Amino acid sequence: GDKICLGHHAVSNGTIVKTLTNEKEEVTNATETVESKSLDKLCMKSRNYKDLGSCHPIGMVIGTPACDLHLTGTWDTLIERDNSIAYCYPGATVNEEALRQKIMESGGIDKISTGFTYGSSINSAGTTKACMRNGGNSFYAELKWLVSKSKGQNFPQTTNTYRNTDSAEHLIIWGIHHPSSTQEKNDLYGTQSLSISVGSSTYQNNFVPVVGARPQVNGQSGRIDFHWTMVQPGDNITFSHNGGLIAPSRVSKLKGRGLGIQSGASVDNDCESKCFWKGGSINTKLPFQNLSPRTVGQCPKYVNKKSLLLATGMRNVPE
């Protein structure tokens, strides 16, 4: 008899995949579902980015010299680098991390003046060689180191209140100076008990500068501790102080939304991407990726597999 036979194709070039019943199935073809390749750069095409270079986000709000180019601006993307400078005079901010995060998600900052005036017996322009600009000693651009105008004299009881007349919350930072010696305290402020209280309608806190001997950084054995809040629209914030306050001259308004990236990778304006990590930028249509759990933007989900092949052909049965 004559005959007609039905059959399928095969390849010698077979591929192995996993199923519900078998861990090695040859199929004719298959495709990778887990992205393993990343670009060694930050793909910034068609984004208003801000590369902070040596500036740390917090320095933008207090006005460290390293951050002079970045005291104001708008951006949809902020880039932090690893040994960026936040502080000139040694110190620390309370809830630094929260503050760092609010700025990195902000998409822009504007500076509004406090209008605080002090009157004589206060010298409101203290400077230090820890915060150089040039020529000479300077201080944080957004704050004022207030000091008795006369060396030994007691610092006057003073009161300053800032009033938010905008319709958006403003961020206020201030510092408290912790001097290195009882002599230094006496010279900058009184020989009197120091006390600083800060109060709004929704916030209330008290501080005491504290004297003591400490290592030098870098620089100085004294310190500044920064503290901050949000002032609601229409609210007033009052500072009551008699020495030790590092007062705000400008407050900050954070503007909208932006993507904050922490990376040392260099910027590239010719590729686009919606996904970033420390090692750069990830651009793929695959649903999963191999590279890092710590990513930002619109990212495929991180998995612990080197490879997951999806079959794109039938079972392979060679001749």
């Binding site: 039905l6 399928h8 199923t19 630094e96 420390k278 649903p287 049965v317």
Partner: protein, 172 residues
């Protein structure tokens, strides 16, 4: 497998077939031939493409860093984050593993099915004029030249035209 054709009663694939995925191959008085089936090959490819269009191209949601790459964070809150992240990685790696496994099981079984459907198609076309060999072939009990073979491949074969002869050769 499930439908018993691929790696079932058809003992192996054809590497010479590169025009399509499923196909025909004949032998008659004028010699042998090979040809691919469009409809069945397209049916299989389109469903693989469908699968690929669901897994690729998905739109993701936006996430911000909750860790710092550069500054040490409080150890307590760090541990809670590590825990939550590892907990979520476990979930996604498991799901991915499951997704692929089951999609692959389905792709393989789909492909088997299309091969069976092509078999069944041809069997019904030949009516009583042929018999199944058992290994994927039909033996034709009438003389089937190259035009007759094409008629089978293009669904124009009229069994009635060859029935009387076929039955006669089936009976002796």
């Amino acid at each position: 497998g499930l439908f018993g054709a691929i790696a079932g009663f058809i003992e192996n694939g054809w590497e010479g077939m590169v025009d399509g995925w499923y196909g025909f191959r004949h032998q008659n008085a004028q010699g042998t031939g090979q040809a691919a089936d469009y409809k069945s090959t397209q049916a299989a490819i389109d469903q693989i493409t469908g699968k690929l269009n669901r897994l690729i191209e998905k739109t993701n949601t936006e996430f911000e860093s909750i860790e710092s790459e550069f500054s040490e964070i409080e150890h307590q809150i760090g541990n809670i984050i590590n825990w939550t992240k590892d907990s979520i990685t476990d979930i996604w790696t498991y799901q991915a593993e499951l997704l692929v496994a089951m999609e692959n099981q389905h792709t393989i079984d789909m492909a088997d099915s299309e091969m069976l459907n092509l078999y069944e198609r041809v069997r019904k076309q030949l009516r009583q004029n042929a018999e199944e060999d058992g290994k994927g072939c039909f033996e034709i009990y009438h003389k089937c030249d190259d035009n007759c073979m094409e008629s089978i491949r293009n669904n124009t074969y009229d069994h009635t035209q060859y029935r009387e002869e076929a039955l006669l050769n089936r009976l002796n």
